[PDB]
Design a protein around this ligand. Sequence first.
Ligand SMILES: CCCCCCCCCCCCCCCC(=O)OC[C@H](COP(=O)(O)O[C@@H]1[C@H](O[C@H]2O[C@H](CO)[C@@H](O)[C@H](O)[C@@H]2O)[C@H](O)[C@@H](O)[C@H](O)[C@H]1O[C@H]1O[C@H](CO)[C@@H](O)[C@H](O)[C@@H]1O)OC(=O)CCCCCCCCCCCCCCC
Ligand SMILES: *[C@@H]1O[C@H](CO)[C@@H](O[C@@H]2O[C@H](CO)[C@@H](O[C@@H]3O[C@H](CO[C@H]4O[C@H](CO)[C@@H](O)[C@H](O)[C@@H]4O)[C@@H](O)[C@H](O[C@H]4O[C@H](CO)[C@@H](O)[C@H](O)[C@@H]4O)[C@@H]3O)[C@H](O)[C@H]2NC(C)=O)[C@H](O)[C@H]1NC(C)=O
Ligand SMILES: *[C@@H]1O[C@H](CO)[C@@H](O)[C@H](O)[C@H]1NC(C)=O
Ligand SMILES: *[C@@H]1O[C@H](CO)[C@@H](O)[C@H](O)[C@H]1NC(C)=O
Lengths: 98, 269
Amino acid sequence: QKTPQIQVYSRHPPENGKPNILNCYVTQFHPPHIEIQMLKNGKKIPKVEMSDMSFSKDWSFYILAHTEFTPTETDTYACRVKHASMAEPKTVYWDRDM
Amino acid sequence: NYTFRCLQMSSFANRSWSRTDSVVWLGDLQTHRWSNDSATISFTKPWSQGKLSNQQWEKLQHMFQVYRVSFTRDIQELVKMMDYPIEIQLSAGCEMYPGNASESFLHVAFQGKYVVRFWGTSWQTVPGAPSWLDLPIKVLNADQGTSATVQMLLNDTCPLFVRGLLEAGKSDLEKQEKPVAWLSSVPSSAHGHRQLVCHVSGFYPKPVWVMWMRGDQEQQGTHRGDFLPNADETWYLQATLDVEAGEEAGLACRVKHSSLGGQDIILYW
Ligand SMILES: CCCCCCCCCCCCCCCC(=O)OC[C@H](COP(=O)(O)O[C@@H]1[C@H](O[C@H]2O[C@H](CO)[C@@H](O)[C@H](O)[C@@H]2O)[C@H](O)[C@@H](O)[C@H](O)[C@H]1O[C@H]1O[C@H](CO)[C@@H](O)[C@H](O)[C@@H]1O)OC(=O)CCCCCCCCCCCCCCC
Ligand SMILES: *[C@@H]1O[C@H](CO)[C@@H](O[C@@H]2O[C@H](CO)[C@@H](O[C@@H]3O[C@H](CO[C@H]4O[C@H](CO)[C@@H](O)[C@H](O)[C@@H]4O)[C@@H](O)[C@H](O[C@H]4O[C@H](CO)[C@@H](O)[C@H](O)[C@@H]4O)[C@@H]3O)[C@H](O)[C@H]2NC(C)=O)[C@H](O)[C@H]1NC(C)=O
Ligand SMILES: *[C@@H]1O[C@H](CO)[C@@H](O)[C@H](O)[C@H]1NC(C)=O
Ligand SMILES: *[C@@H]1O[C@H](CO)[C@@H](O)[C@H](O)[C@H]1NC(C)=O
């Protein structure tokens, strides 16, 4: 029973007003059952595509979530994950500077 | 050079709920998916059938169809002699070396831990696997048609199939996509310090060099993150550098990739 790690990054260089794709990449969890939400200002984002689940050489599962997004000065974007290993949902926020 | 992997993911939640989904990878490119909801294996590439005819492909798809069913109830049958939830994973395929050489593998994990392998001509429990596996595995070994089938697949079918995959998917496997790169920074926890970030996105194949430079001198403080997948079958990586306030001037990020043509990308902070 392993805890998920979350990395949130953009596909292209962010620039305010320009269409982009935001990735949320959830690794290292087990068992494979899991709920991934991508959030805009705390509202769940509707049209979110997920990859097929897979696992690495070390057996832990990983999964790629992604949505279209146009970043602005004022919008925050997050990735929230429910999993059996965690008492509590984990949220990591996109930080264009990190 | 190329690892081909068929990855099985089987969850048994109870006496009558179970699912088995798979994905097949040739290197870092997905070739197939097979959903528990689905009768037939799905192609995720125009070339996913490789050099095989329709007759050969159906035959091979048939043997996996009987396998998905039999695996399910052999496992269920096993549990009802013994504790749910059960998660079983299986990783099967071959590593393709240059000079037409190769090595096959068939590894099985239980509860996220490697426990059983197929090796040579029999199934084996891996050292320190639970002892209760010994009897089921000796019993499965007594089934010669299954064991002859697995040897056949591992020894012949896998490398044979992969060779046609590599031919048929040459323009995807040998594709070049350029990295586009950008810089940002962020405070760090120690006062008067910063972390410069060099992000490199959209590149293919995987091998890349990303380093923070001061002129010709590599900044050995460069800290490479992990390769992160994009969704368009390209890669993402970032390299951070912790620096002192003021000391930022003249730092560059330089990236080398096979598709850039020997002209590195150099960004200046
Ligand atoms: C994308 C393309 C890439 C291609 C390259 C792939 C490279 C990787 C290869 C991966 C192959 C993986 C192996 C699958 C191969 C296969 O065909 O298996 C079929 C076999 C077929 O068996 P089956 O039961 O269906 O039938 C048997 C056999 O059938 C014969 O006929 C089949 C075709 O019709 C063939 O597939 C098979 O090879 C064989 O020729 C057996 O040989 C017979 O002796 C037996 O009688 C038969 O039994 C059936 O009939 C009886 C009725 O009289 C019943 O008693 C019985 O229930 C069944 O109906 O079923 C099983 O053995 C399932 C059990 C496998 C489990 C191993 C995992 C180890 C577990 C790890 C432990 C985890 C912890 C546990 C947690 C508690
Ligand atoms: C698919 O490919 C695999 C190879 O990857 C083949 O598996 C090999 O098959 C042969 C023949 O079945 C095996 O050879 C036999 O091994 C016995 C000793 O094994 C030990 O030693 C070797 C290395 O020293 C280890 O690899 C192995 O794990 C053991 O520790 C020998 O004692 C046997 O010889 C005796 O019995 C035979 C009967 O078969 C007699 O003919 C002999 O004269 C002798 O008295 C025998 O040579 C070999 O070990 C297997 N390889 C591995 C690594 O396990 C599959 O055959 C192949 N399948 C197909 C269908 O192509
Ligand atoms: C089997 O497991 C699933 C939970 O994933 C559940 O919906 C189903 O009711 C279970 N069966 C019972 C009644 O134990
Ligand atoms: C997976 O497939 C089997 C056989 O088709 C089916 O009976 C089972 O309900 C499926 N699992 C789920 C959870 O849908």
